[PDB]
Amino acid sequence: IEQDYMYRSQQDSFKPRLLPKGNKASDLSYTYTKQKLSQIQQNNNKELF
Amino acid sequence: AEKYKNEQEPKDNTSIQRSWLPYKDKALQVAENNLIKNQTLNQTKGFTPFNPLITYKNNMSQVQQHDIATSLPIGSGEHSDQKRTNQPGEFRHVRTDVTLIRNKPVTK
Amino acid sequence: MREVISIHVGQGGIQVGNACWELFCLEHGIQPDGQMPSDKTIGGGDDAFNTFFSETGAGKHVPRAVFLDLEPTVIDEVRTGTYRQLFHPEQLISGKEDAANNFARGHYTIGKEIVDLCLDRIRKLADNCTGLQGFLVFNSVGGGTGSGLGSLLLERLSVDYGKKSKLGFTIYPSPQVSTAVVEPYNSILSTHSLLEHTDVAVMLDNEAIYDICRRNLDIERPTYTNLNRLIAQVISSLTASLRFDGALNVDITEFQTNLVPYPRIHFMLSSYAPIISAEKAYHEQLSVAEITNSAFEPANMMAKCDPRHGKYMACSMMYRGDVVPKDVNASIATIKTKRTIQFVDWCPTGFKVGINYQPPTVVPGGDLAKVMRAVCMISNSTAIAEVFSRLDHKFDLMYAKRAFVHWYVGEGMEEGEFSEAREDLAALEKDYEEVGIET
Amino acid sequence: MREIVHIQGGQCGNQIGAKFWEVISDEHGIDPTGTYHGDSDLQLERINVYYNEATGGRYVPRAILMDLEPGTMDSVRAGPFGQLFRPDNFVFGQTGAGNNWAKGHYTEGAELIDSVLDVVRKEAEGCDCLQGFQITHSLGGGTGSGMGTLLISKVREEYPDRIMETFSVVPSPKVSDTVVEPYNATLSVHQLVENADECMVIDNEALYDICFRTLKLTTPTYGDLNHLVSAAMSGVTCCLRFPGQLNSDLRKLAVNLIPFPRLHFFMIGFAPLTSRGSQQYRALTVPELTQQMFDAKNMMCAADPRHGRYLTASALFRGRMSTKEVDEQMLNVQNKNSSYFVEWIPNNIKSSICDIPPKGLKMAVTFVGNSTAIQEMFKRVAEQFTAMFRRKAFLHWYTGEGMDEMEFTEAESNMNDLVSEYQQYQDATA
Amino acid sequence: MREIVHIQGGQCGNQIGAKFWEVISDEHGIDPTGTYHGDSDLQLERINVYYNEATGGRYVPRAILMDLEPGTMDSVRAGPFGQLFRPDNFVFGQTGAGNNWAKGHYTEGAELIDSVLDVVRKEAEGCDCLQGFQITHSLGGGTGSGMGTLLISKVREEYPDRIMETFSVVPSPKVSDTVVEPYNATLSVHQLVENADECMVIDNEALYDICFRTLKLTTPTYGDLNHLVSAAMSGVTCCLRFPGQLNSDLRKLAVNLIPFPRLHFFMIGFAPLTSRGSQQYRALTVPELTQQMFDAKNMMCAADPRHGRYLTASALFRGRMSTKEVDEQMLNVQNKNSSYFVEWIPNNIKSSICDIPPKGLKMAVTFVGNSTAIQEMFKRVAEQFTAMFRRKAFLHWYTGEGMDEMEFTEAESNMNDLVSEYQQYQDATA
Amino acid sequence: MREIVHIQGGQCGNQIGAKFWEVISDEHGIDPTGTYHGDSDLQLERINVYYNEATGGRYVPRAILMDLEPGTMDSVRAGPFGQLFRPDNFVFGQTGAGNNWAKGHYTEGAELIDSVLDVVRKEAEGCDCLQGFQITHSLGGGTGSGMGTLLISKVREEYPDRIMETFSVVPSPKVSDTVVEPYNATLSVHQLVENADECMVIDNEALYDICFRTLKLTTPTYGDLNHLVSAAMSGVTCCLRFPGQLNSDLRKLAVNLIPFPRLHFFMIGFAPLTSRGSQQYRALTVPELTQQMFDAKNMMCAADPRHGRYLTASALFRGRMSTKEVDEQMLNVQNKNSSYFVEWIPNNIKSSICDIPPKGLKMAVTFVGNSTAIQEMFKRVAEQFTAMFRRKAFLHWYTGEGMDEMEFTEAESNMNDLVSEYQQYQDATA
């Protein structure tokens, strides 16, 4: 009884984490946009051969 | 709620028997107009349906053939404009040009 | 560009083929000689008949089917009948001796010298077509040559062609009405061969159609011609989707994918509606509701089995005529509400419905009337094990005393085949039993 | 100028498009031969969004037609307005899918989709500034539900920033005509939630109910249902093609209708609808339009919206009217039904006005609603799917093409997660 | 402005409503096609009270027709002016009531009432400002007496402040048309007394007496009775639609006529009614009008007013006259008939004047009275009820539908109590 | 604190308790193993009212199972929630009573009752401050009807001050399972009238009517009826275990419900009862709850409560709401049904409230009414008893176990006296 109560209490003490970041097209497009916006400058820096 | 019976004798002519009102009852003469108009309308098509009463049921509807711009012009129904014969081989496919290919190109 | 190949083996097979080809010849307007009579026929893309006929380069059209039989009488009758100019002369393969109701005769001794020619004919006809949908086979189980040649050709085709679809409209012996006395034996052997070599198997018992014809058409003495004409009507209703446009069309590959849940179970039974005489056709309503209610009546089964003793798992219904999807759906809802017909738990939806515009055609001189709405129904149900159990009883009662078995051992096949086929049938009945259990 | 291309496949999709472009051509005054015969210049100013240019001043579709068997295209070619379509845009297979998701997405689809992908890539690069894609298909069939969704995945991988619309018609348990529909429906929805930006769900049972109850016409056909769906489709993109008081594009609709990226399923409706024996007796006014807008039975989905709470709603009005009555009607309907709207999203209603009514009408209304009541349809579909799956019925067909039960389990799990996340956001308070 | 909706159920209610709508369309100048062909501008100033406007300028009445068998309404659409009613305002069953209050009020009446409640709610909310409801029906029939009173209860539950007029054609034993009349009549009057704001009783025998005696026409028929009822019912609400000197609405009538909440049963009369012989031979003067108005035989009720004392009376003169002569005639009829007016209230007669006479006439009078002579109808109905109920005749048809005889006991007790509390003022003295 | 100990006997009482402990454990978050798994702190402060603490933290019921057939015991132990009971509390005979009240009250009951007396005294001493006893049984059996009544008599002898209540499933004639019912019912009610402080009667006929009508479930079962009775029997002790605006314990109810010491039989009901396929709409506000309360055909007894006059009524509301609507609605019921309430006890309704609603409800209520209606059931039972007793049928077994006709004649005389004195209060006037 005591061990079962310990297990139930220690499991019930854990729950409140939702943090919604469903990410398929949102994050794919986010990666694409950040890549473009970042690599434009790194394209306009290169030392010519 | 009545017979409309009109006949020369007054005890059964209604219009003669409804005349005690202070005014002319719009109903009697309206029915007169409906009857005479229905006769003329039936004259146009040709029905002679053994009495005028048969076609008077549907000679009065004001429903237009098409829509009056308060609903989608879906029409009265595609099935309405269908005509059916029953000879064999009327519904075979046609294989139009888009699907009419011969040569099955060899390479990609 | 889609074609199917028809196989007719056995005397009953040839008789069924004659009627079905008469119906096909009529419905495309083909004259008995084989040439288009209208003379207004046009080219271009009007080749609807390609599913059954092929243009011969000069005039006529030849059917895409083969006739196989070891007894020459029926083949000679076809070659001398009214359709002499229709079939290819070297397309009706004839044997020399009949199998005499012995399976070993047609499976081990005589059929080996005919199977090669039949396969050559099949190959040379097959390379002609380009859109092969599949094979339909017709055979009477309770006949020696029929069963033997059917089995041998099925085994040969299963390895020569592979994944091509096969539908077998097989004539099993009736539980009490039968001609021969040794049909349980070769029926066992044919079932053993057919279980693992055919994709769809359709029951075509005789006394069921006898009772239907007696009840509906008011005919006291039907013959095999009426049987064959009804079979032809069923086949045409099945196939019309491939050669006539409709709102919801289906294909040959569309039936096994929606009718057999498991590879082992592929046996099912059919129905056709309505069956109405000419005089009867007047004083009736002929609506989709009543025709679809008649299609599920147990007396309208094409096989002598009562579905009320078993569960349903799948059924395909094809309507032809001026039906509408809303009305067929309302009829389906009424059927589902009906309690006399119940389905298995793991199949909430078990209806595959197709709609075609072409009304059925009527053969002149026939018995059945014509109406513009027809339905053909193919249901697979658990109750079908009843006929297998009856045929097993017949097999046991005579295998206990080893009757007639000398004329099975004397043609080279060992006595051990009976035990193997019996065990296979027992396993099949087992599977048909556990398939219907609730979870 | 921010044009959109059309993609469609399957028998249902082809039937939808064949009449949808008939409606569009009628709206823009284009004859079946492709020659302009309109009345106002506005019908021609923004013609480039849907129609390209050809020799002789005629206009040709930017639409792509796909399927595994030639019957549907053979039918659509000979129908009215069938001469517009360029013969090149037709891509067709010689086998057919046979109501098999595995066949339509793994075996034949893999080698057939390359040509249609090349065609759509050429069409997309042709336009100066692409705006987005719209797909119209059925998830109960094989060819559509397989190859259309594989193409959706491919196009999503190729064009990230563009918008995708999906007019999805899903089989319902009542009007059912296929036995293996739950399997490929679940597979399609699981693959579809991963890529589709917006989804609009359509139910044939709901459409039949609309026709039986509202139009009161005894014997409709698939043509009338396609006409209703086409009117709904043409409504949403009206403001992009014609001027108006408040401009609005599909991107604006997505922004104002997507609270969370995983919540992208909508139910649509059209107004006004009335029988021909009752047309003379109804007055077209904003109150009548807005009350028929929000009536539960009018919706084109089996979901009853009063079983849940609306998250967002949008409205497109067509015709000439003042903004005041529309705004006050929106305020009034939000006030009177506060219980049916979620509480932590105040002002969950969006409006747009376009001054060009449909041909033969004076005012029209298109409604797109994102609400939590959609979850019941997924719940029923999942119930049927699991009921068939516990017994492994009809599984050998799908296993015959490299597929196993791993993706079955993960798809059903993802779908249950989607249902749970709709339920969570409905049962939440500040 | 301050408009009222109309509801009718049952065959008698349908006929009365049809004739009333013909009369009102005549008075306001609407053709059977719904297009205005009036002459004076006064016909359009307050047209919105009884009609709504639709596309094309055609006006439609805001009336609802309800019944359990489509025969009567199928006839009313076929009759003249049957095209005015909007087809959606027709609600019908398929079984019929069979003269059974239980069927029409408990099982199938409650089954069907939802749709009609929806329609009436829609119509009531559509208009700007309600003023009240008016019902016309019978108590001796099944469907009317049951479903109408159920609808009365439902609508009173939703609109507690609005006025409710009822035109009830109560049964008379001389003109008997059904054997089970007292049962459902008692039940309906029971359920009606606590909800109806004003009841006005009409007697077929009384109208027959009017036609045979005053009009002296050989073969009268229900059309004439319907038309007289329509004339009176239209004259009830003349001042609300037309200008006058002393406007009086339904609430004004209620306040002037109702001393106590449970005393709201009225008897009506219309004047002038002239025979076929003397239409040119009688002058039209206020004395003549009031003399014909106060005549006992002129009432629309079988009860003799001469057997009781009026609690209150009201008259609605139409046309042009002098208010002083109206007042003098009222004062004379009060002094010379002091024995017939209850003493402890002074000046218990009200006069109102409207400037528009009925079409085709110079002056007219509509009279409404609350007196104690109404007790006779309830007395005879109750004695018939008890004499038929002590033997429990025809009781099993009622009790076999979830219905019990104890409510019959309560109905009889309540009617005895109402009779007693309505007659104790006859002998009550200050 | 102020706990009550549960004692059940006979098959009826055993089945009643089997579901009572189920409902209570579900309400208080207790598993079949006596393990607490609740979420709120409010579930445990008053848990000692029905439960006792054991080592390890388990809570066990203070219930005493008594019977004559071991079959009931090992049937109820094997079911769910059967492990809560301490086996030492089980007491059962081995020969049975055979529905013989004499055999159960004189021969075997007296012999066996010693052990159950010992255990009940042990529990009564163990409890800190005894509040009362509560019993559940039926008069349609023999063993219950005898040994119960004897146990009540003796425990009242030892505890004349503590309150006590009993629930009685009384037999009904239309659905009757024994010809001995009049005999043992009369004997047991004679014993109970002078002993039980409170008695509450239940009718299986009324239960069947309820589950057929308002639940619309086709197949009821004894489990379903036991669930209904357990819900009602849990509702009464709501505020005793949970806080509220006005807590009102069993002693309060006893003080407020009984006018005279011999009148302590009650009929009850519960609300709301919605159908199983209840659509999701609205909420159960006070008006419909209090209407469904006083629907006389909602009562759990076959007696028609409108056949007589209510001596008093009591309402236990459960949920959070104000008392203004409470008391105004109760006065409204008073004024509208003043005929059903006897005049010399004005304002004769108990109102009590608890803040914690039942599981799965927002608002609920239990009604307990003492009305003059029960006299008809006593009259019919007495009529059946005297009809069976006039020729001394089945009497010889009852005479063969030590008693004679004297007990029967005194019991029937006491019954007639009870009925008469109960009826004079019906027609008594102020």
Ligand SMILES: Nc1nc2c(ncn2[C@@H]2O[C@H](COP(=O)(O)OP(=O)(O)OP(=O)(O)O)[C@@H](O)[C@H]2O)c(=O)[nH]1
């Ligand atoms: N339904 C139907 N069955 C037939 C027909 N003709 C023959 N049969 C069946 O065939 C069985 C006997 O086999 P047959 O078809 O006559 O001959 P076979 O199958 O070629 O075998 P053999 O007798 O060796 O020639 C009979 O029991 C019939 O049931 C027919 O036209 N219609």
Ligand SMILES: Nc1nc2c(ncn2[C@@H]2O[C@H](COP(=O)(O)OP(=O)(O)O)[C@@H](O)[C@H]2O)c(=O)[nH]1
């Ligand atoms: N609303 C509507 N539904 C259609 C239409 N055509 C087909 N359907 C539906 O689509 C389902 C069959 O889909 P199917 O043709 O197999 O899809 P595909 O395999 O991708 O071509 C049927 O249940 C029909 O209800 C149409 O024109 N309109």
Ligand SMILES: Nc1nc2c(ncn2[C@@H]2O[C@H](COP(=O)(O)OP(=O)(O)O)[C@@H](O)[C@H]2O)c(=O)[nH]1
């Ligand atoms: N004055 C008048 N009375 C009518 C008319 N139609 C029916 N009634 C009366 O209504 C009674 C029958 O009522 P019924 O129609 O059966 O009631 P329902 O069944 O509820 O519709 C008869 O006794 C008639 O006297 C009518 O047009 N005018």
Ligand SMILES: Nc1nc2c(ncn2[C@@H]2O[C@H](COP(=O)(O)OP(=O)(O)O)[C@@H](O)[C@H]2O)c(=O)[nH]1
């Ligand atoms: N409501 C209800 N009534 C019951 C139940 N069990 C028995 N009864 C009633 O009790 C009567 C028989 O009582 P009986 O078993 O002889 O009582 P016992 O002798 O004390 O066991 C029957 O008429 C049943 O209606 C139950 O679980 N619930």
Ligand SMILES: [Mg+2]
């Ligand atoms: Mg042969």
